Amino acid sequence: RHKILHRLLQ
Amino acid sequence: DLKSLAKRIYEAYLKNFNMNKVKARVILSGKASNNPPFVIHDMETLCMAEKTLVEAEVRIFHCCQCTSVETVTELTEFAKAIPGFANLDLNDQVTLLKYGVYEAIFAMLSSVMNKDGMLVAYGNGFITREFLKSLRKPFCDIMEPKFDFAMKFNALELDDSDISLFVAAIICCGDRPGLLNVGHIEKMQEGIVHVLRLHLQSNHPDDIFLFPKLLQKMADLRQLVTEHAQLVQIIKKTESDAALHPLLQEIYRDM
Amino acid sequence: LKSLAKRIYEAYLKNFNMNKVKARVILSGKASNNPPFVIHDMETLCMAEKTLVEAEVRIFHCCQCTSVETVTELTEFAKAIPGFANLDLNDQVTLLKYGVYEAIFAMLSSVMNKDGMLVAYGNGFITREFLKSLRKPFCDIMEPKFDFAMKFNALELDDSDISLFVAAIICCGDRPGLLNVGHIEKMQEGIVHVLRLHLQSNHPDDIFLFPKLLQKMADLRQLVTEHAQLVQIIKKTESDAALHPLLQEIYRDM
Ligand SMILES: CC[C@@H](Oc1cccc(CN(CCCOc2ccc(OC)cc2)c2nc3ccccc3o2)c1)C(=O)O
Ligand SMILES: CC[C@@H](Oc1cccc(CN(CCCOc2ccc(OC)cc2)c2nc3ccccc3o2)c1)C(=O)O
């Protein structure tokens, strides 16, 4: 899942 | 190859973390090159620095959180500069950093600590280790353990060029749960750790067995985090008044 | 300089958490209060996981811990061997890279008996049978070190002997990549001279002990090589079982 980490690593 | 890797990692570390050991050492046990750092001892000294640069306990718990969130952001950027990290499965990039960040934070947190207290508010504040001990339970148990670890770690006398390489090694760590292509990370770590050794030997000829001493602390950091993780759930459930920035609440869920 | 033995012995007692005396007492020793927790079934392993901090991988990971501690204790032990400080930095590193796992497997014998080995600072005892039991190839980690241990424990060495041996293992001029080879061979001669003189005065009964012992430094070389390969293969076979980066580095190019 991890909505925010996904966001910071794109 | 490894010529760049060390230096590329170091550049990444200088680019993304505004507080570094050199900046922090100057400010600590320095004179007043312009202004020395505002000291926070009594609760009077805390408040008189809450409009200057920003219950009493919960103001601290919230302020800690804020810099953790900034640092996780700096760490996600730092990570994307580690050669090969970008190319990993995004899912893995995320797993590595979830478990990674608070180990990386407590290592780097050592750089602003000395035996008597720690730098806060980007080097403008200095909050005394004694005042933090002073706090009502369980807020007193937050920093002290990180101090204990710091004094041992600062004892190694590392420079930012060393710390950068170590934090990379901490992040790229294929024994985190839930990784898919474990292999591509283990190779990534081998390279980072080889360089870490070679670097320590040429840069600390005085202490040739620094590399082994350092790496046995990767274990102590895991412990320190776990112990932190428990104490955070307890503060989250002790005070309904002091909850957790959703990023931190997300790195913590199931750890 | 008849104290060289004693200085090395002091260094050996100062740096290593477990030694033969501590281990012999705990093994076949009365419950001074409580005897050491036995690990047979997979239930008995788990029962001791959170007690003092998959199934096969828990073992592979746990082993790693004490290896890592011991490398560090060994780098300190090494800096107490007279003349070691003065060696070329580069050589100090080469001697210890090849040295440590030999010194580990020698000292690992001191916690072993025919039935199992002491772990977790003397509080655990994990049965040789349970370790055989493990899924291939994890069963082939410990058994060979047991085989070696039984033969080595047979020599009946005391810690004062073992200290001198481990020093002799470390200061070893036939490691690959040594520069000042000569100044090490001198350093070994001194340590090994003392080792023999010590064995003659301490074990007058067994006057073939010094030669018997020496031919074990060879078996240890083998045992390590065989270990080193088996570990790389488990690291690369199982995505589930990683290797502490220190160990992965002491193994790199060996
Ligand atoms: C929610 C619980 C929280 O715990 C901790 C525990 C330890 C460290 C942190 C993050 N941190 C502490 C500064 C905040 O401390 C004050 C104190 C007083 C103050 O006065 C206004 C302002 C700030 C920090 N500093 C750093 C400097 C360099 C590198 C990394 C650093 O990490 C948070 C967490 O888990 O995130
Ligand atoms: C990954 C491969 C790994 O192989 C080995 C192989 C043999 C020995 C070791 C190191 N060793 C740990 C054995 C117990 O390890 C546990 C600990 C707890 C436990 O409970 C779950 C089970 C096993 C040990 N060295 C000692 C030196 C002196 C005295 C005692 C010692 O003991 C590692 C390596 O290369 O590091």
Author numbering:
A (entry chain C): 686 to 695
B (entry chain A): 203 to 256, 267 to 467
C (entry chain B): 203 to 255, 267 to 467
Share the article's original sentences.
Peroxisome proliferator-activated receptors (PPARs) are members of families of nuclear receptors, which play an important role in lipid metabolism. PPARα is mainly expressed in metabolically active tissues, such as liver, kidney, heart, and muscle. For physiological functions, PPARα regulates gene expression involved in peroxisomal and mitochondrial β-oxidation, whereas PPARγ modulates the expression involved in energy storage and utilization. Many research groups succeeded in determining the cocrystal structures of PPARs with their agonists, suggesting that there is a common mechanism for the activation; AF2 interface is stabilized by binding of agonists to ligand-binding pocket (LBP) of PPARs ligand binding domain (LBD), and this stabilization makes easy for PPARs to recruit coactivators.
Recently, pemafibrate was identified as a SPPARMα and is shown to have strong potency. To prove this point from structural analysis, crystal structure of PPARα-LBD/pemafibrate/SRC1 complex is determined at 3.2 Å resolution. The structure forms dimer in asymmetric unit, in one subunit the protein binds both with pemafibrate and the SRC1 peptide (green) while in the other subunit the protein binds only with pemafibrate (orange). The structure comparison between SRC1 binding and non-SRC1 binding domains indicates that overall the structures are almost identical to each other; in fact, the root mean square deviation value for Cα atoms is 0.315 Å, which indicates that no drastic conformational change is induced in the PPARα-LBD structure by the binding of SRC1 peptide. In both of the structures, pemafibrate binds to the LBP of PPARα-LBD. The carboxyl group of pemafibrate forms hydrogen bonding interactions with Y314, H440, and Y464, Figure 2C,E, and these interactions were also observed in other agonists bound to PPARα. Here, the flexibility of pemafibrate appeared to be changed with or without binding of SRC1 peptide from structure comparison between the domains. In fact, the electron density of pemafibrate is clearly confirmed in the SRC1 binding domain (blue mesh in Figure 2C); the electron density has a Y-shaped form to fill a cavity at the LBP of PPARα. Crystal structure analysis indicated that chemical groups of pemafibrate occupy three sites (site A, site B, and site C) at LBP of PPARα, whereas fenofibrate can bind to PPARα by occupying two sites from their chemical structure. The difference in the number of interactions would be a reason that pemafibrate works as a strong SPPARMα compared with fenofibrate. Furthermore, this point is well supported by the FMO analysis; around 16 residues at the LBP of PPARα form weak hydrophobic interactions with pemafibrate (see dMP2 values in Figure 3C). The binding of the coactivator fixes the conformation of the phenoxyalkyl group as indicated in the crystal structure analysis.
